[PDB]
Amino acid sequence: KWWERKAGPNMIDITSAEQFLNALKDAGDRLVIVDFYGTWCGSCRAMFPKLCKTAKEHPNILFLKVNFDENKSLCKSLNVKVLPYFHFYRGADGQVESFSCSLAKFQKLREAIERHN
C-alpha cells in the first residue's frame, strides 16, 4: 500500500480507538502529528513522500497515520470532515493544531511544526 512505502519508524498506522489513545498517552511531551488520509485520496498519496521526508528529518516527532476509510467512526468523532487533514497534539496542552493543506502548500505543515518544534 502506498502509505507503507518508505515510512520511517516514527510513522505508525492507527487501526483502533484504544491504540490511538495509547499512542497519544505514551508520547509524553513529544509533538504528535496525526495524519488523517484516505486510501483513494490523490492529494494524500501525492504528499506522502514529503511527509516521509519530514518524519525522517524529525525522528523525535511521532507521526500517527489514520486511514479515514478504515477508521470512519474514529475520524467522524474527531470532527475530521476532509482529507488530507492534520491534528497536532503535545502533552498537557492536548490539541495544538488542526488544519488541512495542499500538496503545493506543504510549507504550512512545516510552519506548524516550527510553532511547536
Side-chain angles (χ1 to χ4, degrees), residues 1-49 51-104 106-107 109-117:
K1 296 306 183 299
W2 63 259
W3 56 90
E4 304 292 1
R5 306 175 191 165
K6 303 288 191 297
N10 58 340
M11 307 182 85
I12 296 308
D13 295 311
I14 296 297
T15 60
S16 74
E18 185 68 13
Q19 177 203 7
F20 184 57
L21 297 192
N22 284 331
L24 293 175
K25 182 57 182 170
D26 292 344
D29 287 314
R30 287 166 71 199
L31 183 61
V32 183
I33 293 179
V34 183
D35 159 35
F36 301 96
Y37 74 99
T39 301
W40 306 282
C41 177
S43 174
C44 298
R45 183 167 196 153
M47 78 183 295
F48 196 63
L51 193 63
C52 288
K53 184 171 180 178
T54 297
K56 182 178 73 170
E57 292 173 346
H58 294 277
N60 303 310
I61 297 178
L62 180 60
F63 293 74
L64 302 184
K65 291 180 275 161
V66 181
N67 187 315
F68 185 98
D69 301 290
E70 303 181 354
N71 296 279
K72 182 173 305 182
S73 291
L74 177 59
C75 293
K76 292 172 65 181
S77 78
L78 294 161
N79 194 30
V80 174
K81 300 270 175 87
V82 293
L83 310 166
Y85 210 74
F86 296 91
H87 285 181
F88 286 26
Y89 299 91
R90 185 165 196 168
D93 288 340
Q95 184 169 299
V96 299
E97 304 286 344
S98 180
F99 63 96
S100 63
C101 67
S102 274
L103 208 201
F106 189 84
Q107 189 64 21
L109 189 135
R110 294 195 189 96
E111 293 167 350
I113 289 176
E114 293 162 358
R115 290 196 286 277
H116 308 279
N117 272 23

